[PDB]
């Protein structure tokens, strides 16, 4: 098992994009091997499929539907296979890019179950899945209303550990750069204000997330300025970028 | 009210000038029937 | 080629369209690839030399994969020329399909000429893209084959195809006016038609290409419009328009017109109700302009436009900045007597603010339109009063207007009243 799979990968890496020729031979067999493989080999095959997909890139579209079905069947609460599949998700997202939004709805049910019940020590499987969601990019447009509540519950939960809370906040920061967040202004700003009370450690990260959100909302943020200012004074939060952005919004200058 | 004329504001609505696109250059490096070496096009690719 | 087109129009804009789908990607050193005589070698062409031969007023359209690299190196050679000038930047417009890092999409459903199609046939890809989104599930039985056989033309606004083109022109001109600063709007969307059309259709390209990890690039950088509320309205407008297509093609049903323009005028009216305060201007102002072009909703728009101008001189300034003047002046060629009380009202408000428009009214012989209204006993005395003011402005300290109204026999008409 191991020897055969490794050789095929090294061949494709050394060839480059000329390996696309061999796709119709390799893929159907390789997928049927993942189906009937057992135990440890499964994890290794999914790792090597990730490499394959990273090399094939856009050309993997015909076989993508089967791969998702495979993932859907073999996703389990086993910590090991979850980290593996999340890595395989990150490689499918960079490979397909814009075409990933066709397949994302199949994966969403499993991602929402990961947040609901993650028993991972320090929720490191959650942090990994956040790092993946960052790659999803403008694919998340039609599904942001589904993904965002779990992320918001993640960084507002006090029981949850600080690393996993920073990971959620940094994710919302990144997604603000690419997605539209006007719809979900209240759903985020109110947990943030609440986070700036319940924990002084996240105050820095949260304020950076807030400023980014402010930059994206613009004049639509005007409503919240009284309420957020009240929370800032209560703990003397004096952020350079944020105070600049507010000052610009009230003035009305656009930049 | 005072018997006084209202000061006319600086009406800047007028267009400074009207441009006219006199001619158009369609440089087409289509290279029909040949594929650029840099990009390895997929078999279906985009034909239209 | 470029030197000849520059000779023809030395002081006028010249369009340079470049389609590099068949040549290798542009280099970091500011070069673009062409062929040799035999078509055996890709020859590079420096952007510096390319921007040497073309002159100052020009516009560049790059439809290739790493098109950002061209725009960067173009601005470099622009700065490099400015440094050499001591011991052509604002004039040169540039549109680019992609950012330097990005690649063009390879998706078999879309045309290879995705960018040019957007710029030059917006409605065609707009409907094809509409049929590719997830929102098609809400309208079953609308495939691409029905879009191919959509009836109508792009001119006839009473047809289904001409309706969408008209709506699209309104929506794009509205997004631009609300998002861009007034200065940059009149620069791009009012100066000349073709540029305004390209940037109008560029806003659609920005939205569509965004959905395939592509970012178009412009030389005068625009703020991101992809998330504007009006885009959602465009979806519904399309939805209602081509939900009828099964019945129009197969059953032969009469195409009912869209409620879009009606509902947008309804929104503008609701704003006017509590519009006394100087709050944010109404989003729908450029739509009211687009409505004036037809006759179907012309009476209602002329009414609302007058009610708006009444609010104050600040509002008349806005309506003149959006560009209402040449359309209100064109309506003075109409003979529909129902327009007479509305145009008299609108023109009194305009000439009260900007008295310089007396020049335009004499040129187009619009002073005859009003002379007729001032010699109509059945016209109410309120509207006849506005007409006498309009004439008293056209004539005011302006020998051309005094000589023109004298020949139009004003003194005899005035003495009658």
Swiss-Prot record, chain A:
First and last residues of every HEAT repeat: 22-60, 62-101, 102-138, 139-177, 178-221, 222-255
Residues with PTM N6-acetyllysine: 251
Intracellular or extracellular location(s): Lysosome membrane; Endoplasmic reticulum membrane; Golgi apparatus membrane; Cell membrane
PTM note: Autophosphorylates when part of mTORC1 or mTORC2. Phosphorylation in the kinase domain modulates the interactions of MTOR with RPTOR and AKT1S1/PRAS40 and leads to increased intrinsic mTORC1 kinase activity.
Tissue spec: Expressed in numerous tissues, with highest levels in testis.
Post-translational modification Phosphothreonine, affected residues: 195
Entry remark concerning the domains of this protein: The kinase domain (PI3K/PI4K) is intrinsically active but has a highly restricted catalytic center. The FAT domain forms three discontinuous subdomains of alpha-helical TPR repeats plus a single subdomain of HEAT repeats. The four domains pack sequentially to form a C-shaped a-solenoid that clamps onto the kinase domain.
Illness the protein is tied to: Smith-Kingsmore syndrome: An autosomal dominant syndrome characterized by intellectual disability, macrocephaly, seizures, umbilical hernia, and facial dysmorphic features. Focal cortical dysplasia 2: A form of focal cortical dysplasia, a malformation of cortical development that results in medically refractory epilepsy in the pediatric population and in adults. FCORD2 is a severe form, with onset usually in childhood, characterized by disrupted cortical lamination and specific cytological abnormalities. It is classified in 2 subtypes: type IIA characterized by dysmorphic neurons and lack of balloon cells; type IIB with dysmorphic neurons and balloon cells.
Function statement: Serine/threonine protein kinase which is a central regulator of cellular metabolism, growth and survival in response to hormones, growth factors, nutrients, energy and stress signals. MTOR directly or indirectly regulates the phosphorylation of at least 800 proteins. Functions as part of 2 structurally and functionally distinct signaling complexes mTORC1 and mTORC2 (mTOR complex 1 and 2).
Similarity section: Belongs to the PI3/PI4-kinase family.
Subunit comment: Part of the mechanistic target of rapamycin complex 1 (mTORC1) which contains MTOR, MLST8 and RPTOR. The mTORC1 complex is a 1 Md obligate dimer of two stoichiometric heterotetramers with overall dimensions of 290 A x 210 A x 135 A. It has a rhomboid shape and a central cavity, the dimeric interfaces are formed by interlocking interactions between the two MTOR and the two RPTOR subunits.
Protein name: Serine/threonine-protein kinase mTOR
Entire protein: shown range: 968 to 1222 of 2549
Curated annotation (Swiss-Prot), chain B:
Tissue note: Highly expressed in skeletal muscle, and in a lesser extent in brain, lung, small intestine, kidney and placenta.
Residues annotated with Phosphoserine modification: 8
The record's account of how the chain is modified after translation: O-GlcNAcylated by OGT upon glucose sufficiency, promoting interaction with small GTPases Rag (RagA/RRAGA, RagB/RRAGB, RagC/RRAGC and/or RagD/RRAGD) and subsequent recruitment of mTORC1 to lysosomal membranes, leading to activation of the mTORC1 complex. Acetylation is decreased in response to fasting.
Taxonomy, superkingdom: Eukaryota
Protein localization: Lysosome membrane; Cytoplasm; Cytoplasmic granule
Function: Component of the mechanistic target of rapamycin complex 1 (mTORC1), an evolutionarily conserved central nutrient sensor that stimulates anabolic reactions and macromolecule biosynthesis to promote cellular biomass generation and growth. In response to nutrients, growth factors or amino acids, mTORC1 is recruited to the lysosome membrane and promotes protein, lipid and nucleotide synthesis by phosphorylating several substrates, such as ribosomal protein S6 kinase (RPS6KB1 and RPS6KB2) and EIF4EBP1 (4E-BP1).
Oligomer and partners: Part of the mechanistic target of rapamycin complex 1 (mTORC1) which contains MTOR, MLST8 and RPTOR. mTORC1 associates with AKT1S1/PRAS40, which inhibits its activity. mTORC1 associates with DEPTOR, which regulates its activity. mTORC1 binds to and is inhibited by FKBP12-rapamycin. Forms a complex with MTOR under both leucine-rich and -poor conditions. Interacts with (via TOS motifs) EIF4EBP1 and RPS6KB1; interaction is independent of its association with MTOR. (Microbial infection) Interacts with vaccinia virus protein F17; this interaction dysregulates mTOR.
Family that this chain belongs to: Belongs to the WD repeat RAPTOR family.
Name this polypeptide is given: Regulatory-associated protein of mTOR
Origin species: Homo sapiens (Human)
